[PDB]
Amino acid sequence: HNKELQTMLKPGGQVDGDEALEFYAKHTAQIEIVRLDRTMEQIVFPVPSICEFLTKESKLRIYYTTERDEQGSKINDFFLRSEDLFNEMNWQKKLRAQPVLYWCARNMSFWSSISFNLAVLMNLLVAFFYPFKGVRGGTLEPHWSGLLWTAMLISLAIVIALPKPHGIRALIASTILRLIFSVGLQPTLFLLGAFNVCNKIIFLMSFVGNCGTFTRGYRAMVLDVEFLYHLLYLLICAMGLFVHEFFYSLLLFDLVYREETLLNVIKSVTRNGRPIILTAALALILVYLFSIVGYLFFKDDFILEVDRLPNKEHTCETLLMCIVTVLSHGLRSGGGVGDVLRKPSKEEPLFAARVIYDLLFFFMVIIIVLNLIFGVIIDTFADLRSEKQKKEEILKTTCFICGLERDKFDNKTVTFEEHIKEEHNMWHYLCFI
Amino acid sequence: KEHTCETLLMCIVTVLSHGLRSGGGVGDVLRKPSKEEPLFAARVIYDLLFFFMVIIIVLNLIFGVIIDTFADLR
């Protein structure tokens, strides 16, 4: 009401009285509610001291992952997420006392990134030369020591660069390559495996630290799928350290499945999986009918050429199951079944029968069915892109709480961007709860 | 004499990238199982899994990404 009073607590950023004014402005929220008589009134309250103990990553997760129900409102799931956020803030305040556990839980990204990187490098080491018979052999430059000296020069040039601006993995890779030639490769791989397993057993503690599920017991931490996945990763890492080496390749999926875009394209493939499975079943039954037709009428045309392992050049398939195997062999090769069956030679009476048989198989099975599978995949891309742009637009041009659109705030003595940060800020609603 | 073998697990990756082409899959370059060796069904499911999953799903994934980018741009 007092315009003179209003214009001297707000612009207090440029005055010397900063402590009291910006402290009390920072620690004061504002919320609007509706009472029984459907009247809207405004409440000004102090924020709790525990509400500042909330990580902004969880805030972004709550802002993005909340979805609207059939009535078009996000508050119903927001309440449950608010309760979970309250428990998370309680555990964060409890955790902040410990100096070393908070240091481990504060740096999860470093442990995860270095584990991913050195497991990738471990897979690259086991992939290039498996039998571990030497390092001197190579189709590279005239000496392997030349490439080793080049790597040493690269490491020396990277050791005088800027402090961790770029090339941090380059010097480590050069050092690992230089250690590979000085000492035997199996000691180097044992050292790298021990480093990865100690990295994983400290990262598991770092993960269970800030995600404080383990303070309530054992059932909740055991039943968690993410903890089980991390434990499985640790188990197969220890198994690949102790018996043979291919389990690093096994955990390469868990490595490369950490980002979102590769996830999105794959998991679009796994979205409408039931049309894909049913189309595969349709292909199987079409192959079955074509195989029994070939068993009935073209039994002697199924001569195909094979080569025999040393202790005549042709085999026949007459069991109606080997014929299904041959038709699934001919489901590949693009042309169809006519590329594996013997050539009709234009003079046998079953020539036109062979021509229409081959053309029907090729056209109907190959074209229609394989194009059906690919059309299902493409349509799933279209559906995902449409719903993603729809939810992004409704998040960007609509208030989270009020649900009103940007078009209602044309002039109205206010703006939308101050409405959605002062009048209807949802973190003020969480603070009030 | 007219034939070579690849036993290094890197030459095998080279041969599998050689067989990532040719459309049919890896079953067109490997020798024919001749129906009587015990590892016949293992070869059949191996070839079918490689062809179906790798060829169909992955190459159709790349082309689907390209087509979806056309749709977004338009």
Added chain:
Amino acid sequence: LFVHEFFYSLLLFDLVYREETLLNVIKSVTRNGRPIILTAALALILVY
């Protein structure tokens, strides 16, 4: 002009990148390049 001749072929790209529709289709390819690179890496690990 001074050494060998194939650098005319090298500058043929700069020649054909002067219109707009070709640029539109090329960077329809290279707009979402990171899904394509990650799908290629997925193919590489499946081959492995």
